[PDB]
RNA sequence: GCCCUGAAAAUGGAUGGCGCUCAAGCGUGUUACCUAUACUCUACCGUCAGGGUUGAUAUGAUGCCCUGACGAGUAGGCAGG
Ligand SMILES: [Mg+2]
Ligand SMILES: [Mg+2]
């Protein structure tokens with residue numbers, strides 16, 4: 001009642017809870033998604049070999 | 053050309069000094085040698101630029117790592133402590 005829900009309006013006049021600018025807080029799962037993984041090129045060595 | 057005369061100032065006095073006369077002087081030529089915080093190569097610190105790396109089961113993706121270049125400073129500005 002005090003702060004409101006998705007089906008109940010908040011008792012505060014004209015107030016709604018703030019929105020999210022990102023859907024989830026774990027970007028690891030977003031990267032590990034099939035669509036992202038199927039569009040990227042293979043990665044490197046993570047520690048480049050010294051050539052000269 | 054060199055040297056000499058012309059050429060007199062006040063504390064004692066300065067090719068920097070000693071001293072030097074086929075010079076250790078003057079003109080000219082040939083080599084060797086000495087040494088700057090400059091140049092060349094290397095290491096280390098920092099700054100700037102271009103890049104690599106999220107895949108869990110280990111901690112900083114403002115992380116870790118690869119590559120190149122650069123570094124004087126009053127008044128003054130900005131940044132990290
Ligand atoms: Mg001579
Ligand atoms: Mg030097």
Ligand SMILES: [Mg+2]
Pocket residue numbers: 123
């Ligand atoms: Mg310099």
Ligand SMILES: [Mg+2]
Pocket residue numbers: none
């Ligand atoms: Mg400086």
